[PDB]
Amino acid sequence: MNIQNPVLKGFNPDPSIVRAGDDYYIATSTFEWFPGVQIHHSKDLVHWHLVAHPLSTTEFLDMKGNPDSGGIWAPDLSYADGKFWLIYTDVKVVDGMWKDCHNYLTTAEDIKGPWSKPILLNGAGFDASLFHDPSGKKYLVNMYWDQRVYHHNFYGIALQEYSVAEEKLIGKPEIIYKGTDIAYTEGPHLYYINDMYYLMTAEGGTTYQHSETIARSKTIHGPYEIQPDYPLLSAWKEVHNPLQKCGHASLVETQNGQWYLAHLTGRPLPAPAGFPSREREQHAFCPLGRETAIQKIEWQDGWPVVVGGQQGSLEVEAPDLPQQEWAPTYEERDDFDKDTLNINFQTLRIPFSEHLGSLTARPGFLRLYGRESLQSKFTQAHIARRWQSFNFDAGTSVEFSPNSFQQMAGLTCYYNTENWSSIHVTWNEEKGRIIDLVTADNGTFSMPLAGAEIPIPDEVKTVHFKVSVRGRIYQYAYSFDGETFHTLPIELPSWKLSDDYVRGGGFFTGAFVGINAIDITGTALPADFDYFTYKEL
Amino acid sequence: MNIQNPVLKGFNPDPSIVRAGDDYYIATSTFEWFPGVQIHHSKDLVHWHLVAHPLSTTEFLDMKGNPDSGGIWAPDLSYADGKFWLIYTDVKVVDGMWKDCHNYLTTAEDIKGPWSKPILLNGAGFDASLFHDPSGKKYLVNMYWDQRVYHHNFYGIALQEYSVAEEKLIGKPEIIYKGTDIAYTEGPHLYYINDMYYLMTAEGGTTYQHSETIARSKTIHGPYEIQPDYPLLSAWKEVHNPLQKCGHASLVETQNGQWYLAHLTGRPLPAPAGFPSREREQHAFCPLGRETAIQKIEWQDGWPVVVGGQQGSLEVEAPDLPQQEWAPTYEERDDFDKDTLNINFQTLRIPFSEHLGSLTARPGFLRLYGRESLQSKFTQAHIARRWQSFNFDAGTSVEFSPNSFQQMAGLTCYYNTENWSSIHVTWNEEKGRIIDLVTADNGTFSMPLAGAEIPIPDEVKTVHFKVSVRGRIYQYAYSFDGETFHTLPIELPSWKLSDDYVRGGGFFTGAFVGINAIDITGTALPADFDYFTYKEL
Amino acid sequence: MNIQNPVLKGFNPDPSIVRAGDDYYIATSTFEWFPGVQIHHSKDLVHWHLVAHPLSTTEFLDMKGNPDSGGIWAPDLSYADGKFWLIYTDVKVVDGMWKDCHNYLTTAEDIKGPWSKPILLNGAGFDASLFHDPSGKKYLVNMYWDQRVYHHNFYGIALQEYSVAEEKLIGKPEIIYKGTDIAYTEGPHLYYINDMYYLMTAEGGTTYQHSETIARSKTIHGPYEIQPDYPLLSAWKEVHNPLQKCGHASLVETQNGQWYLAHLTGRPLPAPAGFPSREREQHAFCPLGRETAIQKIEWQDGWPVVVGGQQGSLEVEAPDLPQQEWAPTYEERDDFDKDTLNINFQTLRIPFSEHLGSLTARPGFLRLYGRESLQSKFTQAHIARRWQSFNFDAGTSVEFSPNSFQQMAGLTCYYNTENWSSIHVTWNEEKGRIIDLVTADNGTFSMPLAGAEIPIPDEVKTVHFKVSVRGRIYQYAYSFDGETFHTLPIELPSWKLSDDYVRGGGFFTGAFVGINAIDITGTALPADFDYFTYKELD
Structure with missing residues (x-):
C-alpha cells in the first residue's frame, strides 16, 4: 500500500514527525482538548495508530479558562540521548496585539511515559522547537512576536542555546532569519544535513495561503540562503488540489536514507455548484479541520523538492520498509x-x-x-x-x-x-x-x-x-x-x-x-x- | 453631618449592608479584581472606611482565566448566631444563553477573618442571599436562570432552606416570586418585619432602567403582594437626577429603629452641550462604575418609601447616632x-x-x-x-x-x-x-x-x-x-x-x-x- | 517607443478597443461621473488622448439618484457599416440579490457625435456587447443575471439577434456559454476569426482574482470549447506583478495583422514593510482605480497567447505603425x-x-x-x-x-x-x-x-x-x-x-x-x- 493522504484524519494539525530507530511518531496539536499532544505511531509511514497523549495532568497543562483555540499549539517531538524531548506551548491569548504563551520542555524514555516535570523555557513566541546539534549542545528556535501595531507580528525566527545542566535558555534571543515576502514566518525547525544547517519554516498563515520554505547556512547563526524555487510546499495556486492549506511541515529521514515531509492540510467540503473556484476563503469549509499528510522528498543541488509538485499529492510512494498494520x-x-x-x-x-x-x-x-x-x-x-x-x-x-x-x-x-x-x-x-x-x-x-x-x-x-x-x-x-x-x-x-x-x-x-x-x-x-x-x- | 452620596465612591456595586451591634458593614462586588469582596465599615452611615477582603486565597476564589466582569458578582453579608455569613458567587460565563456560576458560603467571627472553608451551595442563578428566619431556620434566595432563547432569562426568585446540620440546601428550588413587568428580577433579599415577610428585588437591569421593588407575604413561600407604588427606588424617569441606575439595594434597621437603604448608582459624566437629555444610553458614561449610596426610609401602611422620592437623593439625613470619622x-x-x-x-x-x-x-x-x-x-x-x-x-x-x-x-x-x-x-x-x-x-x-x-x-x-x-x-x-x-x-x-x-x-x-x-x-x-x-x- | 502600461491612467476601467481604419479608440466605464463613457484615441497604441464622452445630456443618461458605482458600467464600442455603435448600461441597483440595469444602443458617424437617440435593448444583465456577423446580421451578447440566493449570480452569456430595421432584439435570450469554474463570467465579446466564433469573457471578478478566458465554436450558438491553457490573462498567481486585477479585455487586429489585447488593471500602493505578500485583499489599495493596459497577442494552434505571460507586462512591443504623440x-x-x-x-x-x-x-x-x-x-x-x-x-x-x-x-x-x-x-x-x-x-x-x-x-x-x-x-x-x-x-x-x-x-x-x-x-x-x-x- 502507498501512503494515502491524509494519514491522520480529522483534527490533527502541526505534525512533528520523528524517527527513533525503526519507530516513527507524529505529534499533533490539541489546543483546548485534553489530554494534550496527540502522538501517533508507525513503522512504515503508511499505517498509523494513536498511542499517547503526554500532557495528561494539570501539572503539565492547566487550561481552565483558556480561549477557544488557545492551549496547545504546534508541538515539537525529537529523539536524542536515549529519550524523547517534547516542546509544547500553552497559549493564553489568541487575538489582538499580543499572543501571550509559554513554551515548556518535557522528556521521556518511552512515548507512553512517564514524562518529566515540565521546564518553562520562554514566551517570546510560539512554535518552539528543539535542535540537537552534532556538537552535543541543544538549541531552541521559536518565532519571535512583535506586538507593535504598525508592524507584521511575525518578526522572524529566534535562536538560543538551551543548557541541559542549568535547565534554561542561556544568553539572549538572536534573530537568525526574517522569512520571505510570504511572511507569517513560523514553525521553525533546524536540521543538520550535507554538513550544513537547514532552517525550514511555515509561511503565509494556516489558511489557503499556507506554505513551507527551506533555507540553509554553513553555521547555525546564518545568514540563511532561501531556496531558489520557494515555496517547497503550497497548494495556494491550485484551487482544485485535493490537499489545501499545505504547510507547517517537518522532515524525516528513514533508516535507508529516504526523505519524507509531514505537513498539515485541509480538505474542504465541495462548495455549491457554480460558485467561483478561487473563492476558497468564502466557500471552502473544512469540518475535519487540519489533518496530517506526508509527501515524499527528493534532493537536487542540496535543496529538497516535493515529489509530484509543491501542491502536495494524495497518493505518495511508500518507503522501502516492511509494512505493519495496527489493531483498531x-x-x-x-x-x-x-x-x-x-x-x-x-x-x-x-x-x-x-x-x-x-x-x-x-x-x-x-x-x-x-x-x-x-x-x-x-x-x-x-x-x-x-x-x-x-x-x-x-x-x-x-x-x-x-x-x-x-x-x-x-x-x-x-x-x-x-x-x-x-x-x-x-x-x-x-x-x-x-x-x-x-x-x-x-x-x-x-x-x-x-x-x-x-x-x-x-x-x-x-x-x-x-x-x-x-x-x-x-x-x-x-x-x-x-x-x-x-x-x-x-x-x-x-x-x-x-x-x-x-x-x-x-x-x-x-x-x-x-x-x-x-x-x-x-x-x-x-x-x-x-x-x-x-x-x- | 449628613450622608453625602455616594458613600462608597468608584467601583463599589451591589451593596449588601448589615448591622452587627453598633457596627455597620457594606460588602460590594469585585468581579475579576483580587482579593474578592470589598468590605467597608461605619458606625454612623456617614463615614466609611475600607477594612477587609475575605476572599484572599485561591482556596476561596480561583479566577485565573475568568472572563472580564465574571468572578465575584453581588455578595450577601449577614450577621447571626455570633458570626458573619458571606454568600458569594463566582461567575464563569457572562454572555449568551447561560450564566454559569457557583454560590458559596463562608463564615467568620471577625470581619477580618479567619473565614471558614467555603461551602458550595448551588448554581441555579446568581444573587444568592442568606436569610436568618426568627425560627432559627436559614433560607437561601437566588434568581433562577432560564436559558431558553425565546424567554426572558430571569425566571424569578427561588427559595430553599439551608441546612446548617448538613451544609446543603434542602429539597428542591421553589419559585416564590416572578417579579413585576419591569423584569430582570434579581438581587433578592428577605426580611422579617411587621410579623411578616418582605422580599425585596432589583429590577430593570443595572442600566439607566434599574430599579428596586418590595413585596410582602404572611408566609415565607408567598404569594407575595407587590407594593402599590412600585418601584421603591428608580431614577429612570429623571434624566437629570445626580444619582442614576438606582437599584440593587439592601435594607438596614439601626439600633434604635431607623431604616436606611443601601443601593448602587452610576454618576455619568456630563454629555456634550446640547445633546438630547433622554439619550443616556448613548451619551451618559460612568468611568467611576457603579458606586454605593444610602437613602433614608420611612414606612406608610406597612410599605417602605424612599425619603425625598424614588429617584434617590445626594444628601440624606444621617441617623441619630454619634458620629465617628476614620483615618484614611x-x-x-x-x-x-x-x-x-x-x-x-x-x-x-x-x-x-x-x-x-x-x-x-x-x-x-x-x-x-x-x-x-x-x-x-x-x-x-x-x-x-x-x-x-x-x-x-x-x-x-x-x-x-x-x-x-x-x-x-x-x-x-x-x-x-x-x-x-x-x-x-x-x-x-x-x-x-x-x-x-x-x-x-x-x-x-x-x-x-x-x-x-x-x-x-x-x-x-x-x-x-x-x-x-x-x-x-x-x-x-x-x-x-x-x-x-x-x-x-x-x-x-x-x-x-x-x-x-x-x-x-x-x-x-x-x-x-x-x-x-x-x-x-x-x-x-x-x-x-x-x-x-x-x-x- | 514601446507601449508603457497602463496606457490610460487613473479611473479608466472596462476598456473596449476598436479599430476604424487607421484610428484606434478605447471606451471606458464612467459609473456615476458625467458625461458618460470616456473615449480615448490613438493611431499607434502607444500615445493616447481623451477625445469624447458621447453620453452628454440627460436624454442619453439620467443618473440623478443613482447609487455610488451605479450608472455607466462596461461600454462596448464597435465600428461597422460606416458608423460607430455604442452599447451602454445604466445600472440602478448595485448590491443585493438583483442588479437592475438597462442596456442601450447609440450610433454616430464621428466619435464626437452627433449620437443617435438611444434605443433601449434589454436588462437581462450588464456587459452588453454588439457583434457584427459577416452575414450582415447583428447580435447582442450580455451576461445573464440569476437572482436566486442559493446560486452564483452569473448564469452565463446570453445571445440574441438585434434587428436594425425593427430597433429591437428579436426572438428570446439563448444561453450559449456558462463559463469556467473561475466563474463571475461577464464581459462577453464575440470575434469571427479562423472562420469560426470566438467568445472571450472576463472571469473571477474585478478583484485580484480577475482573469480573461477565450472559447471557440463553429457556430455562434455553441457549444464553445474553452482554451486549453485558460485563463488567457490573469495576475492572480503573481502577487508582485506590477499589473494586478488583469481582466475585462477586448481584442483588436491592426491594419498589418498584428493582435493586441486591451484590459483593465489595478496598481496597488506598496503595503507597509514586512506585510504578507499574498494578502493583497487586506493590504493592497488602488487609489487610481482600474486603469487600462494593452498586451500583445500571438496565435498558436488557433488560440491567442499573451506575449510575456498571462500575468500581463508593463512594457509591450509597439505595433509596426508610425507614431504620433498628442497635444496635452x-x-x-x-x-x-x-x-x-x-x-x-x-x-x-x-x-x-x-x-x-x-x-x-x-x-x-x-x-x-x-x-x-x-x-x-x-x-x-x-x-x-x-x-x-x-x-x-x-x-x-x-x-x-x-x-x-x-x-x-x-x-x-x-x-x-x-x-x-x-x-x-x-x-x-x-x-x-x-x-x-x-x-x-x-x-x-x-x-x-x-x-x-x-x-x-x-x-x-x-x-x-x-x-x-x-x-x-x-x-x-x-x-x-x-x-x-x-x-x-x-x-x-x-x-x-x-x-x-x-x-x-x-x-x-x-x-x-x-x-x-x-x-x-x-x-x-x-x-x-x-x-x-x-x-x-512622472
Missing part, C-alpha cells in the same frame, strides 16, 4: 464495558475525573454528572471524539431524569463554546421530560424545535440519539426503542462546524461528536450512557 | 515603605505573590517582575486602584532596562483586557530605551506616538509618569527629573473607560489606575517603582 | 479663461449647467453656486478630475463669503458620497470665516481641526488650497497670499480613497481631486475659483 484503537460500538475511557475521546480543557463522570459507578455505562454549560471554558461534563470522515453515523443512548430546563443531557456536534449543536433530554413545565435541540452559531443561540419539543413517555427509560453526517448536511434522530429512529425536521450545516466558518482569532481545531450532561442547578444529576457508536460510511 | 486607608503619595501592599490596590484575578512582585527585594520600592500582557486573563504583574473622583492626578516612577519591544513597564488606566491605555518604558531598535503609549478601545489597539517615541537618555535611570484625569478627558505626562513634566500631546477619552462604553456581556466594574510590567520574552525583567501617587482635585 | 488635453494650471469646462473634469451624475456654476458670470473664474452636500446623490456643485499618478500636487483658490456653517467651499479628494476629504472656507459663530476640514471614511464623518479652525482675516479675499499626494499619504495646505503655504498637520490616507477600501457593493471608480460649493441654506452662495492646478511627478 476503537470499536464501532463502544459499550463502555472497560474502566478506561477510549483514547479517541477527549475532554475540554481539564482532565476526565470523577467530578465529570464515572465508568465504575454503574459498570457497562458511562455515567456523566451534569456540570456547566456548552458555553463554559471551565468545567464541562462532556466527552467527544473527532469527525474523521465526511460521511458517518454516530450515536448514543441516555438515561436521564431532569426536573428542570436547567438540566439536559445528550449528543453533541461541537467546534467551540459558541459553535455547536445539541440534541438532548431535558424538561418542560407543560410536557415534562422532552427531547429538544439547541444550536450555537458564532454566538447566536437558536432553538428550532421551540413549541414542537418531543415528549418522552414516563415508561421510556432510555432515549437513543443518532447523528447522520453526509458532507455539507447533518441531521439528528432519536428513538424510544433502539430500532425505529425519527429524524428531526432540520438540516444542519456541517460547514458551520469548521475552521473556515468560526469567528475569532482562534480557528485551529475541527468538528467533534460527543456526549454531555449539564445541570445548572448544581445537583450533578447523573446521565447514564450505555454506548457510543461511530461508523464511517 | 491610603496616603496621597505611597512611598512603598510598608511591608504589605495598600488595601486600595488590587490585582487581576490571582493573588499578589513573589511571582508578580516584591516589597522586600529592594526595600523602599515595589519591584514588579514582567509577566503577561494587558490582554491576558491569566498572569498580569499589574496592581491598580479605583478611580474615585472625576478629577485627579496619579503617578509613579519606574526604573526599567528593557532590551526588546517585548518588555514594557509603566502607568496604566484600565477597565478590562481590551479597554485600557498604557504609558511605559520600552525599547526600540533605532532609539534604544523609549517612552511609548498604547491604547486598547473595544479590542482595537493603537499606538499614537508611533514614530515620535521619546528617547530616554542612558543617564536617566528613573522615569516619572503622571496621568491627569479631568472629567471627560485625560492626559499622560512624563518627567526625567520628577519636577518638570512634559504632556504627551493626545487627549484620551475618560468616557471610554466606563461601564457604558465597553462591549461584551460584562460591563460591571469601573476604571482603575495602576502600574505594571510586561515581559513577553519570559525573562521576568524587574521594574522598580519608587512611589504611587493618587491625588483627588 | 489640459494644462498644469487652468486659469478658467475658456468658456467650457476642460474635458478632464466631470460632474457627479448630472450635467454641468448654470444651476451648478458658470464660466461667464465672472470671466476668468469658475463660479460655483452652493448646492447640496458631499453626501448627496442628486445635485452637487462639484467638478473633479481623476488622480492619474501616485505623486502629484493639485490646487485652487477661492473667494467665498459664508455667513453660516451651512455654507462651505473648497478643494476635495473624493471617491464616493461617504469616502472623501474636504478643505474649505466656511463660518463659525465666534471666529467668523474659517478654514476647516471634514473627512468621510465609509460613512464615519470626522472633523480633525475642531477647535483649531484657521480664522480667515477679513482683509483676505482669496484663499489658496493645495493637496500634495505622495503615495500612501496626502496632505492639505492653505495660503492667504499664494506664496507662503501652511500645511495642516494631519497625514491623510490615500489608500482609503480606493476601490479596495470602500464598503458596499459598488467599488468601481477611483480617487478624484476637485472643487465644490455647498449651501444647505438654499441661497446658492457663489464661490469663485480662479484656477485649478494639477502637476504629476
Whole structure:
C-alpha cells in the first residue's frame, strides 16, 4: 500500500514527525482538548495508530479558562540521548496585539511515559522547537512576536542555546532569519544535513495561503540562503488540489536514507455548484479541520523538492520498509464495558475525573454528572471524539431524569463554546421530560424545535440519539426503542462546524461528536450512557 | 453631618449592608479584581472606611482565566448566631444563553477573618442571599436562570432552606416570586418585619432602567403582594437626577429603629452641550462604575418609601447616632515603605505573590517582575486602584532596562483586557530605551506616538509618569527629573473607560489606575517603582 | 517607443478597443461621473488622448439618484457599416440579490457625435456587447443575471439577434456559454476569426482574482470549447506583478495583422514593510482605480497567447505603425479663461449647467453656486478630475463669503458620497470665516481641526488650497497670499480613497481631486475659483 493522504484524519494539525530507530511518531496539536499532544505511531509511514497523549495532568497543562483555540499549539517531538524531548506551548491569548504563551520542555524514555516535570523555557513566541546539534549542545528556535501595531507580528525566527545542566535558555534571543515576502514566518525547525544547517519554516498563515520554505547556512547563526524555487510546499495556486492549506511541515529521514515531509492540510467540503473556484476563503469549509499528510522528498543541488509538485499529492510512494498494520484503537460500538475511557475521546480543557463522570459507578455505562454549560471554558461534563470522515453515523443512548430546563443531557456536534449543536433530554413545565435541540452559531443561540419539543413517555427509560453526517448536511434522530429512529425536521450545516466558518482569532481545531450532561442547578444529576457508536460510511 | 452620596465612591456595586451591634458593614462586588469582596465599615452611615477582603486565597476564589466582569458578582453579608455569613458567587460565563456560576458560603467571627472553608451551595442563578428566619431556620434566595432563547432569562426568585446540620440546601428550588413587568428580577433579599415577610428585588437591569421593588407575604413561600407604588427606588424617569441606575439595594434597621437603604448608582459624566437629555444610553458614561449610596426610609401602611422620592437623593439625613470619622486607608503619595501592599490596590484575578512582585527585594520600592500582557486573563504583574473622583492626578516612577519591544513597564488606566491605555518604558531598535503609549478601545489597539517615541537618555535611570484625569478627558505626562513634566500631546477619552462604553456581556466594574510590567520574552525583567501617587482635585 | 502600461491612467476601467481604419479608440466605464463613457484615441497604441464622452445630456443618461458605482458600467464600442455603435448600461441597483440595469444602443458617424437617440435593448444583465456577423446580421451578447440566493449570480452569456430595421432584439435570450469554474463570467465579446466564433469573457471578478478566458465554436450558438491553457490573462498567481486585477479585455487586429489585447488593471500602493505578500485583499489599495493596459497577442494552434505571460507586462512591443504623440488635453494650471469646462473634469451624475456654476458670470473664474452636500446623490456643485499618478500636487483658490456653517467651499479628494476629504472656507459663530476640514471614511464623518479652525482675516479675499499626494499619504495646505503655504498637520490616507477600501457593493471608480460649493441654506452662495492646478511627478 502507498501512503494515502491524509494519514491522520480529522483534527490533527502541526505534525512533528520523528524517527527513533525503526519507530516513527507524529505529534499533533490539541489546543483546548485534553489530554494534550496527540502522538501517533508507525513503522512504515503508511499505517498509523494513536498511542499517547503526554500532557495528561494539570501539572503539565492547566487550561481552565483558556480561549477557544488557545492551549496547545504546534508541538515539537525529537529523539536524542536515549529519550524523547517534547516542546509544547500553552497559549493564553489568541487575538489582538499580543499572543501571550509559554513554551515548556518535557522528556521521556518511552512515548507512553512517564514524562518529566515540565521546564518553562520562554514566551517570546510560539512554535518552539528543539535542535540537537552534532556538537552535543541543544538549541531552541521559536518565532519571535512583535506586538507593535504598525508592524507584521511575525518578526522572524529566534535562536538560543538551551543548557541541559542549568535547565534554561542561556544568553539572549538572536534573530537568525526574517522569512520571505510570504511572511507569517513560523514553525521553525533546524536540521543538520550535507554538513550544513537547514532552517525550514511555515509561511503565509494556516489558511489557503499556507506554505513551507527551506533555507540553509554553513553555521547555525546564518545568514540563511532561501531556496531558489520557494515555496517547497503550497497548494495556494491550485484551487482544485485535493490537499489545501499545505504547510507547517517537518522532515524525516528513514533508516535507508529516504526523505519524507509531514505537513498539515485541509480538505474542504465541495462548495455549491457554480460558485467561483478561487473563492476558497468564502466557500471552502473544512469540518475535519487540519489533518496530517506526508509527501515524499527528493534532493537536487542540496535543496529538497516535493515529489509530484509543491501542491502536495494524495497518493505518495511508500518507503522501502516492511509494512505493519495496527489493531483498531476503537470499536464501532463502544459499550463502555472497560474502566478506561477510549483514547479517541477527549475532554475540554481539564482532565476526565470523577467530578465529570464515572465508568465504575454503574459498570457497562458511562455515567456523566451534569456540570456547566456548552458555553463554559471551565468545567464541562462532556466527552467527544473527532469527525474523521465526511460521511458517518454516530450515536448514543441516555438515561436521564431532569426536573428542570436547567438540566439536559445528550449528543453533541461541537467546534467551540459558541459553535455547536445539541440534541438532548431535558424538561418542560407543560410536557415534562422532552427531547429538544439547541444550536450555537458564532454566538447566536437558536432553538428550532421551540413549541414542537418531543415528549418522552414516563415508561421510556432510555432515549437513543443518532447523528447522520453526509458532507455539507447533518441531521439528528432519536428513538424510544433502539430500532425505529425519527429524524428531526432540520438540516444542519456541517460547514458551520469548521475552521473556515468560526469567528475569532482562534480557528485551529475541527468538528467533534460527543456526549454531555449539564445541570445548572448544581445537583450533578447523573446521565447514564450505555454506548457510543461511530461508523464511517 | 449628613450622608453625602455616594458613600462608597468608584467601583463599589451591589451593596449588601448589615448591622452587627453598633457596627455597620457594606460588602460590594469585585468581579475579576483580587482579593474578592470589598468590605467597608461605619458606625454612623456617614463615614466609611475600607477594612477587609475575605476572599484572599485561591482556596476561596480561583479566577485565573475568568472572563472580564465574571468572578465575584453581588455578595450577601449577614450577621447571626455570633458570626458573619458571606454568600458569594463566582461567575464563569457572562454572555449568551447561560450564566454559569457557583454560590458559596463562608463564615467568620471577625470581619477580618479567619473565614471558614467555603461551602458550595448551588448554581441555579446568581444573587444568592442568606436569610436568618426568627425560627432559627436559614433560607437561601437566588434568581433562577432560564436559558431558553425565546424567554426572558430571569425566571424569578427561588427559595430553599439551608441546612446548617448538613451544609446543603434542602429539597428542591421553589419559585416564590416572578417579579413585576419591569423584569430582570434579581438581587433578592428577605426580611422579617411587621410579623411578616418582605422580599425585596432589583429590577430593570443595572442600566439607566434599574430599579428596586418590595413585596410582602404572611408566609415565607408567598404569594407575595407587590407594593402599590412600585418601584421603591428608580431614577429612570429623571434624566437629570445626580444619582442614576438606582437599584440593587439592601435594607438596614439601626439600633434604635431607623431604616436606611443601601443601593448602587452610576454618576455619568456630563454629555456634550446640547445633546438630547433622554439619550443616556448613548451619551451618559460612568468611568467611576457603579458606586454605593444610602437613602433614608420611612414606612406608610406597612410599605417602605424612599425619603425625598424614588429617584434617590445626594444628601440624606444621617441617623441619630454619634458620629465617628476614620483615618484614611491610603496616603496621597505611597512611598512603598510598608511591608504589605495598600488595601486600595488590587490585582487581576490571582493573588499578589513573589511571582508578580516584591516589597522586600529592594526595600523602599515595589519591584514588579514582567509577566503577561494587558490582554491576558491569566498572569498580569499589574496592581491598580479605583478611580474615585472625576478629577485627579496619579503617578509613579519606574526604573526599567528593557532590551526588546517585548518588555514594557509603566502607568496604566484600565477597565478590562481590551479597554485600557498604557504609558511605559520600552525599547526600540533605532532609539534604544523609549517612552511609548498604547491604547486598547473595544479590542482595537493603537499606538499614537508611533514614530515620535521619546528617547530616554542612558543617564536617566528613573522615569516619572503622571496621568491627569479631568472629567471627560485625560492626559499622560512624563518627567526625567520628577519636577518638570512634559504632556504627551493626545487627549484620551475618560468616557471610554466606563461601564457604558465597553462591549461584551460584562460591563460591571469601573476604571482603575495602576502600574505594571510586561515581559513577553519570559525573562521576568524587574521594574522598580519608587512611589504611587493618587491625588483627588 | 514601446507601449508603457497602463496606457490610460487613473479611473479608466472596462476598456473596449476598436479599430476604424487607421484610428484606434478605447471606451471606458464612467459609473456615476458625467458625461458618460470616456473615449480615448490613438493611431499607434502607444500615445493616447481623451477625445469624447458621447453620453452628454440627460436624454442619453439620467443618473440623478443613482447609487455610488451605479450608472455607466462596461461600454462596448464597435465600428461597422460606416458608423460607430455604442452599447451602454445604466445600472440602478448595485448590491443585493438583483442588479437592475438597462442596456442601450447609440450610433454616430464621428466619435464626437452627433449620437443617435438611444434605443433601449434589454436588462437581462450588464456587459452588453454588439457583434457584427459577416452575414450582415447583428447580435447582442450580455451576461445573464440569476437572482436566486442559493446560486452564483452569473448564469452565463446570453445571445440574441438585434434587428436594425425593427430597433429591437428579436426572438428570446439563448444561453450559449456558462463559463469556467473561475466563474463571475461577464464581459462577453464575440470575434469571427479562423472562420469560426470566438467568445472571450472576463472571469473571477474585478478583484485580484480577475482573469480573461477565450472559447471557440463553429457556430455562434455553441457549444464553445474553452482554451486549453485558460485563463488567457490573469495576475492572480503573481502577487508582485506590477499589473494586478488583469481582466475585462477586448481584442483588436491592426491594419498589418498584428493582435493586441486591451484590459483593465489595478496598481496597488506598496503595503507597509514586512506585510504578507499574498494578502493583497487586506493590504493592497488602488487609489487610481482600474486603469487600462494593452498586451500583445500571438496565435498558436488557433488560440491567442499573451506575449510575456498571462500575468500581463508593463512594457509591450509597439505595433509596426508610425507614431504620433498628442497635444496635452489640459494644462498644469487652468486659469478658467475658456468658456467650457476642460474635458478632464466631470460632474457627479448630472450635467454641468448654470444651476451648478458658470464660466461667464465672472470671466476668468469658475463660479460655483452652493448646492447640496458631499453626501448627496442628486445635485452637487462639484467638478473633479481623476488622480492619474501616485505623486502629484493639485490646487485652487477661492473667494467665498459664508455667513453660516451651512455654507462651505473648497478643494476635495473624493471617491464616493461617504469616502472623501474636504478643505474649505466656511463660518463659525465666534471666529467668523474659517478654514476647516471634514473627512468621510465609509460613512464615519470626522472633523480633525475642531477647535483649531484657521480664522480667515477679513482683509483676505482669496484663499489658496493645495493637496500634495505622495503615495500612501496626502496632505492639505492653505495660503492667504499664494506664496507662503501652511500645511495642516494631519497625514491623510490615500489608500482609503480606493476601490479596495470602500464598503458596499459598488467599488468601481477611483480617487478624484476637485472643487465644490455647498449651501444647505438654499441661497446658492457663489464661490469663485480662479484656477485649478494639477502637476504629476512622472
